[PDB]
Scaffold this active site. Sequence first.
Site, PDB file in Angstrom:
ATOM      1  N   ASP A   1      24.897  46.439  -4.980  1.00 38.11           N
ATOM      2  CA  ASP A   1      25.015  44.992  -5.096  1.00 38.11           C
ATOM      3  C   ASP A   1      24.804  44.341  -3.735  1.00 38.11           C
ATOM      4  O   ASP A   1      25.475  44.687  -2.758  1.00 38.11           O
ATOM      5  CB  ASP A   1      26.387  44.623  -5.661  1.00 38.11           C
ATOM      6  CG  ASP A   1      26.529  43.137  -5.945  1.00 38.11           C
ATOM      7  OD1 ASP A   1      25.540  42.392  -5.782  1.00 38.11           O
ATOM      8  OD2 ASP A   1      27.638  42.712  -6.332  1.00 38.11           O
TER       9      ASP A   1
ATOM     10  N   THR B   1      21.013  40.380  -8.457  1.00 29.73           N
ATOM     11  CA  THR B   1      21.029  40.871  -7.083  1.00 29.73           C
ATOM     12  C   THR B   1      20.032  41.997  -6.843  1.00 29.73           C
ATOM     13  O   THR B   1      19.828  42.382  -5.687  1.00 29.73           O
ATOM     14  CB  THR B   1      22.437  41.339  -6.709  1.00 29.73           C
ATOM     15  OG1 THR B   1      22.846  42.385  -7.601  1.00 29.73           O
ATOM     16  CG2 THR B   1      23.420  40.182  -6.805  1.00 29.73           C
TER      17      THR B   1
END
Lengths: 491, 494, 482, 62, 458
Positions: free
Chosen positions: B46, B79
């Site tokens: 992430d 992301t």
Amino acid sequence: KPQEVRKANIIAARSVADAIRTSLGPKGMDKMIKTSRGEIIISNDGHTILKQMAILHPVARMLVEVSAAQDSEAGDGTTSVVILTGALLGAAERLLNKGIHPTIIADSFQSAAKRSVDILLEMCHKVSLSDREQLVRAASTSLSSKIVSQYSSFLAPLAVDSVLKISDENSKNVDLNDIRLVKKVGGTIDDTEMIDGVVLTQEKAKIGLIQFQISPPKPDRQMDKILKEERAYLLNICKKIKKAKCNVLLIQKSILRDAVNDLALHFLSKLNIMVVKDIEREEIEFLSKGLGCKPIADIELFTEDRLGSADLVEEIDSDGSKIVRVTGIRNNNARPTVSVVIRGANNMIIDETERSLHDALCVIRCLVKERGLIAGGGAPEIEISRRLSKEARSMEGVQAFIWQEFASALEVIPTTLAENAGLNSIKVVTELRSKHENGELNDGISVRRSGTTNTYEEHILQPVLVSTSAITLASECVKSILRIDDIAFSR
Amino acid sequence: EKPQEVRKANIIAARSVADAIRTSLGPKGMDKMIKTSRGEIIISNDGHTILKQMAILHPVARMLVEVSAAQDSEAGDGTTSVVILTGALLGAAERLLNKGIHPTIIADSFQSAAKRSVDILLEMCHKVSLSDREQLVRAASTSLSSKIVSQYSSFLAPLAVDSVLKISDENSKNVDLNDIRLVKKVGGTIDDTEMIDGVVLTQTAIKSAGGPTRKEKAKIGLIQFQISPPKEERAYLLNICKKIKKAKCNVLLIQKSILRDAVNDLALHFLSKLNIMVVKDIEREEIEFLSKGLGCKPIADIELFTEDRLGSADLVEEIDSDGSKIVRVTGIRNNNARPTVSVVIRGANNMIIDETERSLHDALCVIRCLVKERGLIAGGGAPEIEISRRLSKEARSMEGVQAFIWQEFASALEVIPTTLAENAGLNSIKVVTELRSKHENGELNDGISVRRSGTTNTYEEHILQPVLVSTSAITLASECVKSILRIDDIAFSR
Amino acid sequence: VGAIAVGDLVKSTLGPKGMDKLLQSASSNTCMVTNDGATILKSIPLDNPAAKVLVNISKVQDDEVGDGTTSVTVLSAELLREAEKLIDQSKIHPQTIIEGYRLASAAALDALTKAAVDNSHDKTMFREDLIHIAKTTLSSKILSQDKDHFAELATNAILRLKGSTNLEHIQIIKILGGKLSDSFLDEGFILAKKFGNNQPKRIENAKILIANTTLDSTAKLAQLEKAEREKMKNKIAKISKFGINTFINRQLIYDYPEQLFTDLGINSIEHADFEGVERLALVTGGEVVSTFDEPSKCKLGECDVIEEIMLGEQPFLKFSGCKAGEACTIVLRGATDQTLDEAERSLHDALSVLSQTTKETRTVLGGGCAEMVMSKAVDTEAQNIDGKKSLAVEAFARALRQLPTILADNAGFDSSELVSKLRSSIYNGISTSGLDLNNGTIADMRQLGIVESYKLKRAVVSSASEAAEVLLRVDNIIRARP
Amino acid sequence: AENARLSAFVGAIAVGDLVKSTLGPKGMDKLLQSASSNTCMVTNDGATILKSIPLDNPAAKV
Amino acid sequence: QHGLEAKKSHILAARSVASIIKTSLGPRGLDKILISPDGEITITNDGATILSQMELDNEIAKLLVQLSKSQDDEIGDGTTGVVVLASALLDQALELIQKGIHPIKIANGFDEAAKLAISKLEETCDDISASNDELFRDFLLRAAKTSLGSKIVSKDHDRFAEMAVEAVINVMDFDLIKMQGRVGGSISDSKLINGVILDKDFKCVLPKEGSDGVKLAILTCPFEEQDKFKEMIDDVKKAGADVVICQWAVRWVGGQELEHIAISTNGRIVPRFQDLSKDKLGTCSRIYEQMLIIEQSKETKTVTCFVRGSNKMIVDEAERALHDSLCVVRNLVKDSRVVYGGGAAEVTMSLAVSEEADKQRGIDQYAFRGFAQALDTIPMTLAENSGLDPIGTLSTLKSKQLKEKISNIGVDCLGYGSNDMKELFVVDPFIGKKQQILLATQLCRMILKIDNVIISGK
């Protein structure tokens, strides 16, 4: 950086010019110089000082050639040329900040130098060609740059009477190259006297000259063969010399290879023939002019015509030193040669006497080169600066401020004499400026009285040529330094 | 040219961040292992977590963290794609400075192209119903598969969709996720993840006596203060319990009292003697969730305690599974306009539990864009070249040197399919060569697929993305790179 | 010579096309991106007090103008460059050199009066130019793309003032999240705060009241300790007699008195530092009350709508029912605070300046035009003054001719061709001639769409030009080292 | 390419600034001091100056 | 190092500090930045305060500490160049010590030469007290306008001078008067009141039973609980005193500021609560805020000025000029002898010794001429700042003053086209020029006797 790079060398030049100020005048002090070979040389003049001084700055190196020109002229007080040079460079820094070009500053010094020569001609005192009264007073006075006049009592008439008898009373050139300065160990300074003829450094005998080297046939049953052949060639040379009636032979430098065989000396000993070797070729000029000897290259050309002529030749032994004295001179010459033998107890005294006597001969040469007399003690330096100070306000222009600084630099020479004697710099000069208006030009200044008094009555006289050559050589040195605006290091 | 050298070094720092995240882009991305200064190891792909622990002394590199953080506020997902869009425009800006183009002209070229890119996305929108199952998964399916646990995401795909559809609005609101809480526990697997219709509190109470194992027909209260003598002794605490039984409150919720009142042993025995359930050691941040969810008003003083400020619940019990103690609340009374739910997360390692948690927050933010805007576009970087088709074609009308930078913005869109080809183990040019021919004419939504290794329909593989994902990100990414070019140099101050 | 190097760093800080300068603080490792060098020169340390004087004088230019405050510093930087040339070449004493520009300053100040155009009576040109103000002076930064968007905020705010010179009645709100184009104008008093969870959301005809204060056995002591909890009961009882359902406190409020306000149906507002307490009392008609006994002394506030609404990310406050138009509200919205922090200074460049422009009706063409006109008028005094100061009079126009080179160098175009064409057009008798950085040519202000209100040009272009000559009299010489 | 045209054109500029005034009596000079041999030369013309100073600039060969 | 070489390593450093303040003399001065070792920044064009506080090594500048604390307190006008004036006699002696002159011969040479020029000052001396009050007051207006204030007050001194002269007339038959100011306003906006400025605040006082008085009460000890608190307050209102002053309603009054209140009101300090009576109450017109304004209806001995300016440095420069203005005006009214300064008085004493140098002759001949050249360097300082040639201008002025015996014509410090100081109404105290030119010889007595400097250890 045209200005800053040149100014960096000026500070180093003024530092050397300030250090030599202590070497000027009878109250001055000299320096010790240790040569790279280990020999100590101590002298008051700046000739040896600048010769052994090595400075990476090119301005300090150019001062050697400028001083060397004045050293061959006067020899005493020659440091004033560098002192005046360092004074003009220091004064030019303030003149350059006013917006004046360096060449204009350099050209203004030459323009003021031309007026300085005319002042020396107007202040020139009449002097007779040949006299023992005037030449002695001027000789011992210029020697005050060192310690001389104490022992000069016998030395003063020597240099006066010798030079006049070398050539003539007609002045013109009268070069000093014909003088042979002989240095021998022993005796005192007052014992130094002139010789009527040429003397040898190394009864009615004839002096010859040999450019070759006497030796067996070796240019640069075997036992009897070597002895007979070598003695045969040496005997043939002795027969040619015996027929020529030459009792004194002179040989060139033998230190190389052949030298002289001992067998040749045995044959010449029975005939009472002198043998002298290791003679420099520069002595031939003294042998040809004085003794009338013609160089003999080979024994085949050996004859009596090439031999010299003399009246009485004998050997004089002074304090263990063997000296060959020649009485009388017979030859064809317009300028007979006179030799002087220097005597002294220690080598330091003998070496100091040479430079003291050589400088005493140069001041006599300056009198026969250009006739004249000027005041001593730096008195003419003020009257030259006095006129240039008044002429600066008359012409005005941009040279008015330059001539004022050029005149102020001329006052450094008489100031140096006062500072070395323990007198206040400005306080004495301030009192002199009122005395220079009193004494009225040629009236000079004496060192002993430390004030303005008579010159001829006090036996103070200086030649005009030294002051003329000093200003000329100092002006050429200052204009060359300011004209070079930068330096470079390369091959 | 000192300002030109500063911006040149900023591009290198921007490409360094883009090259690192490049390996983590797309569903084929790779996780990153970072060692924190505190001694905790967090491994995730992430971009929000990677840049959170990233320590770089470079000023612009520190500002790049806030750039990616700005995308989390507007969108909160994607992301694996939109992160490189920040460094994508800066990578092609090197040749723009050599041409002598003024930075404001560069800023005006990207801003004008940003409005054109939005209109292109509005032409490709698709009809999406408010209540559905398979179609809503297609938009999230690009972001659904990241972590190792994506193999079990087949059951988690309808769960994340039905979780947002549980509490939502048909008026296209912001869809606040504060009402949906994700609770975690030790033990179990991610395949056992279940959803609860009511507030579930996983906080572990002290449970000194622990007499009651559950409460039936109990009133859940909210108490900010703590029961204890001010700091004959038991008589003061029993009178407080009489006021509790006066309002028939069997469940007490108390925050952390260790700051002042701490905890008393007599108060714990009195509640267990009367079989009164109590939960202590509760954080202050949980007051907002428990008050709005159950409809309970905070009570700061025993005098203010009354029945009107208390809620009610059918059954309140404590579930014990795999050694973990969780409290499930069955039923909710005093209903309000802010209902709340709960989803129990099961895992083994604490890192694995937090690994699946970030995957859920990434999935829940996807439906928020679908509810706000029903438009739908193709995923997997397919429209990136399709948008560039409508851009570079108009370059002939740019009227002068503006056409040069106009093509650079279209060439910057080729970075998305380039990173996907290298992350999937395919040739870079071979993908670009097929896309330029495929996007030329036929239809729409076509593009490269990493699974089939070819250019085809993206909806056939059930890979799509919402329209607001690239709409707000590209506009925000193009705005942030404008301020980066405004830095003349870096000067240290007090 | 300490202020000479300052002009090099602030050279790029002027002009609408100028580039921002990044600031980096050693503490906390923070950063800031701004154009004007007011904060730049303040945050960056200075080892020469000569540069510190330029910082102290820039604080006045913030409230007076605020847009390009370094325009005064760049003038002194260029004058010292020509002053050192006069010390060397002309060899003039520095006092005469400084007074040479001071004597020529009278011609520069009189040039603004001759070029001043008097506007009076009909406001048709006044209200129409308010929209065009946002296109030039408002944003010289990266926000220049928002000029058309921010025009609605600045136009309706000045018309709402109706002669209000008080700046403390204007509130600036920054909404977190969203985009710069999402900023909307709202009618009312907007303030960023929050409420409690159990507190009433809306109350009809609520009143505003602020506060300057801050709100044998172990259990045997409970009889003596309960008196402390009763002390707060006497305070809330006297406040409840006022009949006010909304309470405001400057400092923080403990949880114990917080829930006591909800029992009586009284809202609570906290986290108010400076602008929260002062402006809320002026807008709603409140006053600081140290009594809290009889509702007589000081003043009590009132508000029609106390309900809180959600604007952007964090919900803010919307207050309606104000019967006085003295207070205005301008609401902005942005994703990050980087562009929002500098967006506040844009309001101080125009909106906050227009409050004091009601007295000055004179106008002059700016944007490089007014600086060149003063250079043309000072040339006529060169032959009249003569003397040794004549060199400083001609050099005074040289500093004004280098001002358009600042905008040309920041735009990337060559400054030699642009200024050469700018000077020749102005010397022909055209006062409207100005520099065009978009097309790289010379065009009039009206042809380029550059128009501002007649009251604004006096307090920005003419004020900074007049205040510069006041600040150009600072003497700069060799200082004393510590 | 940047320093290629610079160092080539300044080869005659560096040591030639002093010889620009060579024409006329006001001409500046240049002093060349050798590292050994006690040699040196003073002239305002770059002929002897250039030939006696080795330079690594390739443009000096022309 | 000892001897003459040691004297040059110290005394010659006085030329450095002389050239620092050389450009700052007069209205043509420039602002110089000074940094104290503690970090404070001082920027002013007055060279007297520049050399007052400084950190230096050589002790040759340490003798200026007694000079700065004297001329500034005694006169204050023309004290900017007192160091250059003192170094003028030293710079001439530096050339004399190079000639070998004894310091006592230099000290006695400058001492006797300075006394001979006093008779010349008596010939040109005037009297401002012999005229009426119109001319005497007008001379005080232009005295400090063309000389004293060098900062911004050149044109605007008419406001500061008029407020200063009126303060002198009221107390005419400043140590008992406290004066200060707050940053703000402008030059012409300054206010003048009869009383002392009270910065502490508590509103309006109405006329009491007595004419033009408030019957002011001042108690040092605080009231000492609630029963006696309100009881002692009512005792203050018994005499009709609305305003009360106590250390622990005006509160927190300084020690020195409290006494100035009783001096202006001619009251007494009441230490106890039993000594309060109408005889111990001060007389004050009223107290109000227009900082509270203390007014006095009757003429009193306390009259203060309130300085106002647009810059924080103007308040410090204008107030400090008022401290020096009160000292100059004090000596003008006390000493009837006055002279015309501003370059005329310094050149006047130069021509007196110049004519007396040829009469004495002797060893003092060049010593008296050096004292004349030392005074000729004083106008050379203002010549460079005004653009005039120092050598060229003085050579012309000395030629004009040779035929005409009036020495008032000279170098103008303002730089205008009028070289006559009598036309510009420039008047300086006769005792001022005596404490500057003549007293500078006393400072030279310590410098000329410097021989060997002993530097001890730590």
